[PDB]
Design an enzyme around this catalytic site. Sequence first.
Site, PDB file in Angstrom:
ATOM      1  N   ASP A  62      34.237 -54.213  20.998  1.00 22.26           N
ATOM      2  CA  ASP A  62      33.077 -53.349  21.146  1.00 22.26           C
ATOM      3  C   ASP A  62      31.730 -54.340  21.351  1.00 22.26           C
ATOM      4  OD1 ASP A  62      30.887 -51.394  20.213  1.00 22.26           O
ATOM      5  OD2 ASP A  62      32.424 -50.061  20.606  1.00 22.26           O
ATOM      6  N   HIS A  79      27.412 -50.318  16.925  1.00 23.31           N
ATOM      7  CA  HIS A  79      28.826 -49.762  16.726  1.00 23.31           C
ATOM      8  C   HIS A  79      29.987 -50.407  16.467  1.00 23.31           C
ATOM      9  CE1 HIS A  79      26.448 -47.508  19.885  1.00 23.31           C
ATOM     10  NE2 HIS A  79      26.577 -46.627  19.104  1.00 23.31           N
ATOM     11  N   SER A 103      34.322 -41.992  18.915  1.00 25.58           N
ATOM     12  CA  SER A 103      34.443 -43.260  18.622  1.00 25.58           C
ATOM     13  C   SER A 103      34.533 -43.791  17.338  1.00 25.58           C
ATOM     14  CB  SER A 103      33.206 -44.037  19.276  1.00 25.58           C
ATOM     15  OG  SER A 103      33.361 -43.642  20.644  1.00 25.58           O
ATOM     16  N   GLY A 138      37.327 -39.654  24.056  1.00 23.86           N
ATOM     17  CA  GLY A 138      36.180 -39.547  24.846  1.00 23.86           C
ATOM     18  C   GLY A 138      35.214 -38.699  24.105  1.00 23.86           C
TER      19      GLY A 138
HETATM   20 CA    CA Z   1      35.550 -38.693  29.288  1.00 17.50          CA
END
Ligand code: CA
Length: 465
Positions: free
Chosen positions: A44, A85, A259, A185
Amino acid sequence: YQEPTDPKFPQQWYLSGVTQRDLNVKAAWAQGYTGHGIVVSILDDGIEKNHPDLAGNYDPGASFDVNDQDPDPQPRYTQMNDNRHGTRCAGEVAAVANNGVCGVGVAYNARIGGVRMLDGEVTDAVEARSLGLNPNHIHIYSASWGPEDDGKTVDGPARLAEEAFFRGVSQGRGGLGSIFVWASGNGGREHDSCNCDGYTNSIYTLSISSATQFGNVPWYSEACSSTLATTYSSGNQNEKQIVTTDLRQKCTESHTGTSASAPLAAGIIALTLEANKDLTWRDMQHLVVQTSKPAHLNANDWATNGVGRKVSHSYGYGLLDAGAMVALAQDWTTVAPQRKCIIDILTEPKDIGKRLEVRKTVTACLGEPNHITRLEHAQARLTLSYNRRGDLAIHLVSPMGTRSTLLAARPHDYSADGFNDWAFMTTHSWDEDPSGEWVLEIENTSEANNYGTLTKFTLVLYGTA
Ligand SMILES: [Ca+2]
Ligand SMILES: [Ca+2]
Ligand SMILES: [Ca+2]
Ligand SMILES: [Ca+2]
Protein backbone atom coordinates in the site's frame (compact mmCIF):
# COMPACT_ATOMS: atom_id res chain seq x y z
CA TYR A 1 -4.97 -17.16 27.84
CA GLN A 2 -6.69 -13.92 28.81
CA GLU A 3 -8.78 -11.51 26.71
CA PRO A 4 -6.88 -8.42 25.53
CA THR A 5 -6.73 -5.47 27.93
CA ASP A 6 -6.07 -2.81 25.27
CA PRO A 7 -8.13 0.35 25.81
CA LYS A 8 -9.96 0.21 22.44
CA PHE A 9 -10.45 -3.57 22.24
CA PRO A 10 -14.06 -3.24 23.40
CA GLN A 11 -14.63 -0.86 20.43
CA GLN A 12 -13.30 -3.59 18.07
CA TRP A 13 -16.79 -4.99 17.83
CA TYR A 14 -15.91 -7.36 14.93
CA LEU A 15 -13.55 -9.17 17.36
CA SER A 16 -14.61 -8.46 20.94
CA GLY A 17 -18.30 -8.77 20.15
CA VAL A 18 -20.52 -10.83 22.40
CA THR A 19 -23.67 -10.63 20.31
CA GLN A 20 -22.60 -13.56 18.16
CA ARG A 21 -22.04 -11.06 15.32
CA ASP A 22 -18.26 -11.17 14.96
CA LEU A 23 -15.36 -12.91 13.22
CA ASN A 24 -15.09 -15.60 15.95
CA VAL A 25 -11.45 -14.69 16.62
CA LYS A 26 -11.53 -15.13 20.41
CA ALA A 27 -12.23 -18.81 19.82
CA ALA A 28 -8.96 -19.10 17.85
CA TRP A 29 -6.95 -17.09 20.36
CA ALA A 30 -8.27 -19.30 23.15
CA GLN A 31 -7.10 -22.44 21.23
CA GLY A 32 -3.67 -20.77 21.36
CA TYR A 33 -3.49 -19.29 17.85
CA THR A 34 -2.49 -15.62 17.71
CA GLY A 35 -0.25 -15.66 14.60
CA HIS A 36 3.14 -16.58 16.08
CA GLY A 37 5.71 -17.27 13.36
CA ILE A 38 3.58 -15.96 10.53
CA VAL A 39 4.62 -12.95 8.43
CA VAL A 40 2.17 -10.60 6.68
CA SER A 41 2.90 -7.65 4.41
CA ILE A 42 0.62 -4.68 3.47
CA LEU A 43 1.14 -3.62 -0.15
CA ASP A 44 0.00 0.00 0.00
CA ASP A 45 1.16 3.59 0.70
CA GLY A 46 3.72 2.64 3.37
CA ILE A 47 3.80 1.71 7.04
CA GLU A 48 4.56 3.74 10.15
CA LYS A 49 6.95 1.15 11.58
CA ASN A 50 7.55 3.17 14.77
CA HIS A 51 3.86 3.28 15.62
CA PRO A 52 3.52 2.32 19.35
CA ASP A 53 0.98 -0.42 18.40
CA LEU A 54 3.07 -1.77 15.47
CA ALA A 55 6.76 -1.45 16.42
CA GLY A 56 6.67 -4.55 18.62
CA ASN A 57 5.60 -6.72 15.68
CA TYR A 58 7.34 -4.83 12.85
CA ASP A 59 9.43 -6.89 10.48
CA PRO A 60 11.93 -5.22 8.15
CA GLY A 61 12.11 -8.57 6.37
CA ALA A 62 8.48 -8.13 5.32
CA SER A 63 8.92 -4.55 4.13
CA PHE A 64 10.34 -2.53 1.30
CA ASP A 65 10.00 0.85 -0.41
CA VAL A 66 9.45 0.31 -4.12
CA ASN A 67 8.61 3.95 -4.71
CA ASP A 68 12.07 5.13 -3.57
CA GLN A 69 13.89 1.81 -4.00
CA ASP A 70 15.15 1.46 -0.41
CA PRO A 71 14.33 -0.87 2.53
CA ASP A 72 12.34 1.58 4.71
CA PRO A 73 8.57 1.75 4.05
CA GLN A 74 7.92 4.81 6.22
CA PRO A 75 5.12 6.89 4.70
CA ARG A 76 5.20 10.56 3.75
CA TYR A 77 3.23 12.97 5.93
CA THR A 78 0.83 15.44 4.29
CA GLN A 79 -1.99 17.69 5.46
CA MET A 80 -4.67 15.39 3.98
CA ASN A 81 -2.99 12.29 5.46
CA ASP A 82 -2.94 10.71 2.03
CA ASN A 83 -0.57 7.94 3.14
CA ARG A 84 -2.46 6.72 6.18
CA HIS A 85 -3.91 3.61 4.58
CA GLY A 86 -1.09 1.07 4.96
CA THR A 87 -0.66 1.90 8.63
CA ARG A 88 -4.39 1.44 9.25
CA CYS A 89 -4.41 -1.91 7.46
CA ALA A 90 -1.23 -3.13 9.26
CA GLY A 91 -2.86 -2.59 12.62
CA GLU A 92 -5.90 -4.62 11.63
CA VAL A 93 -3.69 -7.64 11.00
CA ALA A 94 -1.12 -7.27 13.76
CA ALA A 95 -1.39 -4.39 16.21
CA VAL A 96 0.31 -5.36 19.49
CA ALA A 97 -1.89 -6.70 22.28
CA ASN A 98 -1.87 -6.01 26.00
CA ASN A 99 0.25 -2.90 25.73
CA GLY A 100 -2.26 -0.24 26.82
CA VAL A 101 -2.41 1.23 23.33
CA CYS A 102 -5.35 1.36 20.89
CA GLY A 103 -6.73 -2.13 20.11
CA VAL A 104 -5.25 -5.35 18.80
CA GLY A 105 -4.64 -7.12 15.50
CA VAL A 106 -6.47 -10.28 14.56
CA ALA A 107 -3.03 -11.89 14.55
CA TYR A 108 -1.46 -9.95 17.36
CA ASN A 109 1.64 -12.16 17.61
CA ALA A 110 2.25 -12.20 13.87
CA ARG A 111 5.02 -10.16 12.31
CA ILE A 112 3.91 -7.32 10.08
CA GLY A 113 5.58 -5.40 7.30
CA GLY A 114 4.58 -3.08 4.51
CA VAL A 115 5.59 -2.26 1.00
CA ARG A 116 5.54 1.40 0.13
CA MET A 117 4.41 1.31 -3.46
CA LEU A 118 1.32 3.53 -4.00
CA ASP A 119 2.99 6.88 -3.26
CA GLY A 120 4.58 7.34 -6.68
CA GLU A 121 4.03 6.27 -10.26
CA VAL A 122 2.51 2.79 -10.12
CA THR A 123 3.77 0.87 -13.11
CA ASP A 124 3.48 -2.81 -14.01
CA ALA A 125 7.04 -3.21 -12.77
CA VAL A 126 6.28 -1.55 -9.42
CA GLU A 127 3.37 -3.92 -8.92
CA ALA A 128 5.42 -7.00 -9.83
CA ARG A 129 8.22 -6.01 -7.46
CA SER A 130 5.75 -5.58 -4.59
CA LEU A 131 3.95 -8.91 -5.20
CA GLY A 132 7.31 -10.66 -5.39
CA LEU A 133 8.95 -9.21 -2.28
CA ASN A 134 10.81 -11.87 -0.23
CA PRO A 135 8.40 -14.71 -1.14
CA ASN A 136 10.11 -17.24 1.15
CA HIS A 137 9.94 -14.89 4.11
CA ILE A 138 6.49 -13.30 3.74
CA HIS A 139 3.56 -15.77 3.95
CA ILE A 140 0.63 -13.51 3.23
CA TYR A 141 0.22 -10.30 1.26
CA SER A 142 -2.73 -7.93 1.62
CA ALA A 143 -3.74 -5.36 -1.01
CA SER A 144 -6.71 -3.43 -2.41
CA TRP A 145 -5.51 -1.85 -5.57
CA GLY A 146 -7.05 -2.21 -8.99
CA PRO A 147 -8.73 -0.16 -11.71
CA GLU A 148 -10.68 2.94 -10.84
CA ASP A 149 -13.97 1.99 -9.17
CA ASP A 150 -15.99 4.28 -11.48
CA GLY A 151 -18.23 1.49 -12.78
CA LYS A 152 -16.92 2.14 -16.32
CA THR A 153 -13.49 0.51 -16.37
CA VAL A 154 -12.32 -2.99 -17.33
CA ASP A 155 -8.66 -3.59 -16.51
CA GLY A 156 -6.32 -5.82 -14.55
CA PRO A 157 -2.65 -6.70 -14.03
CA ALA A 158 -0.34 -6.28 -17.04
CA ARG A 159 2.30 -8.92 -17.92
CA LEU A 160 4.87 -8.47 -15.19
CA ALA A 161 2.33 -8.40 -12.37
CA GLU A 162 0.45 -11.38 -13.83
CA GLU A 163 3.73 -13.32 -13.95
CA ALA A 164 4.51 -12.30 -10.36
CA PHE A 165 1.13 -13.61 -9.18
CA PHE A 166 1.87 -16.88 -10.94
CA ARG A 167 5.45 -17.16 -9.71
CA GLY A 168 4.10 -16.29 -6.25
CA VAL A 169 1.52 -19.06 -6.01
CA SER A 170 3.86 -21.51 -7.83
CA GLN A 171 7.16 -20.97 -6.08
CA GLY A 172 6.45 -18.73 -3.10
CA ARG A 173 6.64 -20.08 0.45
CA GLY A 174 8.95 -22.92 -0.52
CA GLY A 175 6.42 -24.12 -3.09
CA LEU A 176 3.26 -23.86 -0.98
CA GLY A 177 2.39 -20.55 -2.62
CA SER A 178 2.14 -16.93 -1.56
CA ILE A 179 -1.31 -16.14 -0.22
CA PHE A 180 -2.52 -12.92 -1.91
CA VAL A 181 -5.54 -11.49 -0.01
CA TRP A 182 -7.49 -8.87 -1.94
CA ALA A 183 -10.30 -6.38 -1.38
CA SER A 184 -13.01 -6.63 -4.05
CA GLY A 185 -13.61 -2.94 -4.56
CA ASN A 186 -15.36 0.18 -3.37
CA GLY A 187 -17.40 1.09 -6.48
CA GLY A 188 -20.89 0.25 -5.21
CA ARG A 189 -22.23 3.82 -5.57
CA GLU A 190 -21.26 3.67 -9.26
CA HIS A 191 -22.84 0.21 -9.74
CA ASP A 192 -19.43 -1.31 -10.35
CA SER A 193 -19.21 -5.09 -10.88
CA CYS A 194 -15.96 -6.53 -9.53
CA ASN A 195 -15.33 -9.13 -12.28
CA CYS A 196 -14.26 -6.05 -14.33
CA ASP A 197 -11.27 -5.79 -11.94
CA GLY A 198 -8.59 -8.31 -12.98
CA TYR A 199 -6.78 -8.19 -9.63
CA THR A 200 -9.76 -9.31 -7.58
CA ASN A 201 -11.17 -11.50 -10.41
CA SER A 202 -7.91 -13.57 -10.44
CA ILE A 203 -7.82 -17.13 -9.15
CA TYR A 204 -4.52 -16.23 -7.52
CA THR A 205 -6.10 -13.68 -5.20
CA LEU A 206 -8.25 -14.69 -2.30
CA SER A 207 -10.91 -11.99 -2.55
CA ILE A 208 -12.90 -10.45 0.25
CA SER A 209 -15.95 -8.17 0.46
CA SER A 210 -17.65 -6.34 3.35
CA ALA A 211 -20.67 -6.53 5.63
CA THR A 212 -21.99 -3.74 7.83
CA GLN A 213 -22.40 -4.12 11.59
CA PHE A 214 -26.11 -4.85 11.26
CA GLY A 215 -25.29 -7.54 8.67
CA ASN A 216 -26.11 -5.64 5.47
CA VAL A 217 -24.43 -5.04 2.11
CA PRO A 218 -22.66 -1.64 2.45
CA TRP A 219 -23.24 1.18 0.01
CA TYR A 220 -19.71 0.84 -1.38
CA SER A 221 -19.78 -2.94 -2.00
CA GLU A 222 -19.26 -4.47 -5.42
CA ALA A 223 -20.95 -7.80 -6.20
CA CYS A 224 -19.25 -10.41 -8.39
CA SER A 225 -18.82 -14.19 -8.74
CA SER A 226 -15.05 -14.02 -8.14
CA THR A 227 -15.38 -13.06 -4.46
CA LEU A 228 -14.80 -15.88 -1.94
CA ALA A 229 -15.87 -14.43 1.40
CA THR A 230 -16.58 -11.51 3.73
CA THR A 231 -15.42 -9.61 6.78
CA TYR A 232 -17.00 -6.75 8.66
CA SER A 233 -16.36 -3.14 7.75
CA SER A 234 -18.20 0.23 7.86
CA GLY A 235 -21.80 1.06 6.98
CA ASN A 236 -24.21 3.86 7.84
CA GLN A 237 -23.81 6.40 10.61
CA ASN A 238 -25.50 4.23 13.23
CA GLU A 239 -23.09 1.36 12.56
CA LYS A 240 -19.58 1.19 14.01
CA GLN A 241 -16.46 1.18 11.85
CA ILE A 242 -12.97 -0.30 11.94
CA VAL A 243 -10.75 0.59 14.90
CA THR A 244 -7.02 0.52 14.28
CA THR A 245 -3.62 2.18 14.17
CA ASP A 246 -3.45 5.50 12.29
CA LEU A 247 -0.76 7.75 10.91
CA ARG A 248 1.08 10.05 13.36
CA GLN A 249 1.01 7.38 16.10
CA LYS A 250 -2.75 7.71 16.52
CA CYS A 251 -5.71 5.38 17.00
CA THR A 252 -8.65 5.75 14.57
CA GLU A 253 -12.21 4.51 15.04
CA SER A 254 -13.20 5.47 11.48
CA HIS A 255 -11.39 3.15 9.03
CA THR A 256 -13.89 2.33 6.28
CA GLY A 257 -14.68 0.48 3.06
CA THR A 258 -13.77 -2.82 1.51
CA SER A 259 -10.09 -2.03 1.89
CA ALA A 260 -10.54 -2.45 5.62
CA SER A 261 -11.99 -5.96 5.12
CA ALA A 262 -9.07 -7.53 3.34
CA PRO A 263 -6.64 -6.99 6.27
CA LEU A 264 -9.02 -8.66 8.76
CA ALA A 265 -9.11 -11.61 6.36
CA ALA A 266 -5.30 -11.54 6.13
CA GLY A 267 -5.14 -11.74 9.94
CA ILE A 268 -7.56 -14.68 10.09
CA ILE A 269 -5.52 -16.41 7.42
CA ALA A 270 -2.38 -15.89 9.53
CA LEU A 271 -4.09 -17.63 12.49
CA THR A 272 -5.04 -20.47 10.15
CA LEU A 273 -1.50 -20.84 8.78
CA GLU A 274 -0.19 -20.96 12.33
CA ALA A 275 -2.62 -23.84 12.84
CA ASN A 276 -1.23 -25.66 9.79
CA LYS A 277 1.87 -24.21 8.21
CA ASP A 278 1.70 -26.74 5.38
CA LEU A 279 -1.46 -25.26 3.84
CA THR A 280 -0.99 -24.29 0.18
CA TRP A 281 -2.50 -21.24 -1.49
CA ARG A 282 -5.27 -23.50 -2.82
CA ASP A 283 -5.81 -25.27 0.53
CA MET A 284 -6.46 -21.84 2.04
CA GLN A 285 -9.13 -21.04 -0.50
CA HIS A 286 -10.76 -24.43 0.17
CA LEU A 287 -10.82 -23.69 3.92
CA VAL A 288 -12.52 -20.35 3.32
CA VAL A 289 -15.11 -21.97 1.05
CA GLN A 290 -15.90 -24.71 3.60
CA THR A 291 -16.01 -22.68 6.81
CA SER A 292 -17.43 -19.28 5.96
CA LYS A 293 -20.83 -18.45 7.45
CA PRO A 294 -23.85 -16.95 5.63
CA ALA A 295 -25.92 -17.03 8.82
CA HIS A 296 -26.08 -13.43 9.99
CA LEU A 297 -25.75 -11.80 6.57
CA ASN A 298 -28.57 -10.18 4.68
CA ALA A 299 -28.60 -10.36 0.88
CA ASN A 300 -31.22 -10.76 -1.81
CA ASP A 301 -29.17 -13.16 -3.89
CA TRP A 302 -28.30 -16.07 -1.62
CA ALA A 303 -28.48 -19.28 -3.61
CA THR A 304 -27.53 -22.87 -2.88
CA ASN A 305 -25.01 -24.40 -5.25
CA GLY A 306 -24.67 -27.95 -6.55
CA VAL A 307 -22.90 -29.20 -3.43
CA GLY A 308 -25.34 -27.58 -0.98
CA ARG A 309 -23.40 -24.44 0.04
CA LYS A 310 -25.11 -21.04 0.19
CA VAL A 311 -23.34 -18.43 -1.90
CA SER A 312 -23.88 -14.76 -2.67
CA HIS A 313 -22.27 -12.37 -5.14
CA SER A 314 -22.01 -9.70 -2.42
CA TYR A 315 -20.59 -12.01 0.23
CA GLY A 316 -19.17 -15.11 -1.45
CA TYR A 317 -19.52 -18.03 0.96
CA GLY A 318 -20.23 -15.65 3.84
CA LEU A 319 -18.44 -14.31 6.85
CA LEU A 320 -14.96 -15.57 7.75
CA ASP A 321 -15.00 -17.59 11.00
CA ALA A 322 -11.54 -17.80 12.54
CA GLY A 323 -12.44 -20.52 15.01
CA ALA A 324 -13.76 -22.74 12.25
CA MET A 325 -10.81 -21.94 9.98
CA VAL A 326 -8.27 -22.97 12.61
CA ALA A 327 -10.25 -26.06 13.51
CA LEU A 328 -10.56 -27.32 9.93
CA ALA A 329 -6.91 -26.44 9.23
CA GLN A 330 -5.78 -28.93 11.89
CA ASP A 331 -7.57 -31.79 10.13
CA TRP A 332 -6.95 -30.79 6.54
CA THR A 333 -5.41 -33.07 3.91
CA THR A 334 -3.54 -31.02 1.36
CA VAL A 335 -5.22 -31.02 -2.05
CA ALA A 336 -4.13 -32.90 -5.18
CA PRO A 337 -2.30 -31.13 -8.05
CA GLN A 338 -4.21 -28.38 -9.83
CA ARG A 339 -5.57 -29.38 -13.23
CA LYS A 340 -6.60 -26.91 -15.93
CA CYS A 341 -9.02 -27.99 -18.67
CA ILE A 342 -9.50 -25.51 -21.52
CA ILE A 343 -12.61 -25.89 -23.67
CA ASP A 344 -13.33 -23.87 -26.83
CA ILE A 345 -17.10 -23.55 -26.82
CA LEU A 346 -17.94 -21.64 -30.02
CA THR A 347 -17.81 -23.06 -33.55
CA GLU A 348 -18.83 -19.74 -35.15
CA PRO A 349 -19.52 -16.19 -33.94
CA LYS A 350 -22.99 -15.53 -32.45
CA ASP A 351 -25.13 -12.45 -32.73
CA ILE A 352 -26.01 -11.05 -29.30
CA GLY A 353 -28.84 -8.64 -30.08
CA LYS A 354 -31.36 -8.48 -27.24
CA ARG A 355 -30.37 -11.85 -25.84
CA LEU A 356 -28.09 -14.82 -26.54
CA GLU A 357 -27.95 -18.26 -24.97
CA VAL A 358 -25.06 -20.63 -25.69
CA ARG A 359 -25.37 -24.22 -24.48
CA LYS A 360 -22.60 -26.78 -24.58
CA THR A 361 -22.13 -30.25 -23.13
CA VAL A 362 -18.55 -30.79 -22.06
CA THR A 363 -16.62 -33.77 -20.69
CA ALA A 364 -14.19 -31.65 -18.66
CA CYS A 365 -11.21 -33.33 -20.30
CA LEU A 366 -12.44 -36.85 -19.72
CA GLY A 367 -9.80 -39.46 -20.49
CA GLU A 368 -6.94 -36.97 -20.12
CA PRO A 369 -4.42 -35.93 -17.42
CA ASN A 370 -6.35 -32.68 -16.88
CA HIS A 371 -9.71 -34.40 -16.34
CA ILE A 372 -11.55 -32.53 -13.61
CA THR A 373 -14.27 -34.07 -11.45
CA ARG A 374 -13.96 -31.59 -8.59
CA LEU A 375 -14.06 -27.97 -9.71
CA GLU A 376 -12.29 -25.14 -7.98
CA HIS A 377 -12.41 -21.93 -10.01
CA ALA A 378 -14.10 -21.65 -13.42
CA GLN A 379 -13.52 -18.92 -16.02
CA ALA A 380 -15.50 -17.90 -19.04
CA ARG A 381 -13.03 -16.05 -21.28
CA LEU A 382 -15.23 -13.97 -23.56
CA THR A 383 -14.50 -11.95 -26.65
CA LEU A 384 -17.40 -9.80 -27.82
CA SER A 385 -18.34 -6.50 -29.40
CA TYR A 386 -21.24 -4.41 -28.14
CA ASN A 387 -22.31 -0.81 -28.64
CA ARG A 388 -22.92 -0.03 -24.93
CA ARG A 389 -21.03 -2.38 -22.59
CA GLY A 390 -22.85 -1.52 -19.37
CA ASP A 391 -26.22 -2.58 -20.71
CA LEU A 392 -25.05 -6.19 -20.76
CA ALA A 393 -25.63 -8.75 -18.01
CA ILE A 394 -23.90 -12.11 -18.38
CA HIS A 395 -24.62 -15.35 -16.49
CA LEU A 396 -23.04 -18.82 -16.50
CA VAL A 397 -24.98 -21.90 -15.37
CA SER A 398 -23.13 -25.09 -14.42
CA PRO A 399 -24.43 -28.59 -15.27
CA MET A 400 -25.55 -29.05 -11.65
CA GLY A 401 -27.64 -25.88 -12.05
CA THR A 402 -25.69 -23.13 -10.31
CA ARG A 403 -26.21 -19.68 -11.84
CA SER A 404 -23.21 -17.38 -11.56
CA THR A 405 -23.56 -13.76 -12.53
CA LEU A 406 -20.43 -13.03 -14.51
CA LEU A 407 -21.38 -9.41 -15.19
CA ALA A 408 -24.26 -7.29 -13.89
CA ALA A 409 -25.50 -4.19 -15.70
CA ARG A 410 -23.16 -1.23 -15.12
CA PRO A 411 -25.34 1.73 -16.11
CA HIS A 412 -22.51 4.24 -16.23
CA ASP A 413 -20.39 2.10 -18.58
CA TYR A 414 -20.98 3.50 -22.07
CA SER A 415 -17.88 1.89 -23.57
CA ALA A 416 -18.07 0.64 -27.17
CA ASP A 417 -14.93 -1.43 -26.67
CA GLY A 418 -16.62 -4.71 -25.61
CA PHE A 419 -14.47 -7.43 -24.00
CA ASN A 420 -11.22 -8.75 -25.45
CA ASP A 421 -10.61 -12.26 -24.19
CA TRP A 422 -11.72 -11.16 -20.72
CA ALA A 423 -11.67 -13.98 -18.16
CA PHE A 424 -14.79 -13.65 -15.99
CA MET A 425 -14.20 -15.89 -12.92
CA THR A 426 -16.66 -17.67 -10.61
CA THR A 427 -16.05 -19.41 -7.28
CA HIS A 428 -19.74 -20.37 -6.90
CA SER A 429 -19.36 -23.86 -8.36
CA TRP A 430 -16.48 -24.90 -6.11
CA ASP A 431 -16.49 -28.71 -5.53
CA GLU A 432 -19.11 -29.37 -8.22
CA ASP A 433 -18.64 -31.89 -11.02
CA PRO A 434 -18.25 -29.76 -14.16
CA SER A 435 -19.23 -32.57 -16.57
CA GLY A 436 -22.39 -31.93 -18.54
CA GLU A 437 -24.19 -28.96 -20.03
CA TRP A 438 -23.01 -25.41 -19.30
CA VAL A 439 -25.14 -22.45 -20.34
CA LEU A 440 -23.90 -18.94 -21.08
CA GLU A 441 -26.54 -16.14 -21.08
CA ILE A 442 -25.90 -12.63 -22.41
CA GLU A 443 -28.76 -10.15 -22.10
CA ASN A 444 -29.37 -6.55 -23.03
CA THR A 445 -30.90 -5.22 -19.82
CA SER A 446 -31.81 -1.88 -21.37
CA GLU A 447 -34.80 -0.99 -23.53
CA ALA A 448 -32.31 0.46 -26.04
CA ASN A 449 -31.84 -1.38 -29.32
CA ASN A 450 -28.34 -2.64 -28.71
CA TYR A 451 -26.19 -4.88 -30.90
CA GLY A 452 -22.99 -6.85 -30.98
CA THR A 453 -21.35 -10.17 -31.50
CA LEU A 454 -19.81 -12.89 -29.33
CA THR A 455 -16.76 -14.19 -31.21
CA LYS A 456 -15.07 -16.34 -28.59
CA PHE A 457 -16.13 -18.26 -25.47
CA THR A 458 -13.46 -20.35 -23.77
CA LEU A 459 -14.55 -22.29 -20.71
CA VAL A 460 -11.61 -22.82 -18.36
CA LEU A 461 -12.07 -25.30 -15.53
CA TYR A 462 -9.63 -25.65 -12.61
CA GLY A 463 -9.62 -28.41 -10.02
CA THR A 464 -8.84 -32.05 -9.26
CA ALA A 465 -9.92 -35.64 -10.11
CA1 CA B 1 -14.26 -2.05 -8.95
CA1 CA C 1 11.84 4.78 2.19
CA1 CA D 1 -2.54 -2.49 21.39
CA1 CA E 1 -9.59 -13.43 -6.50
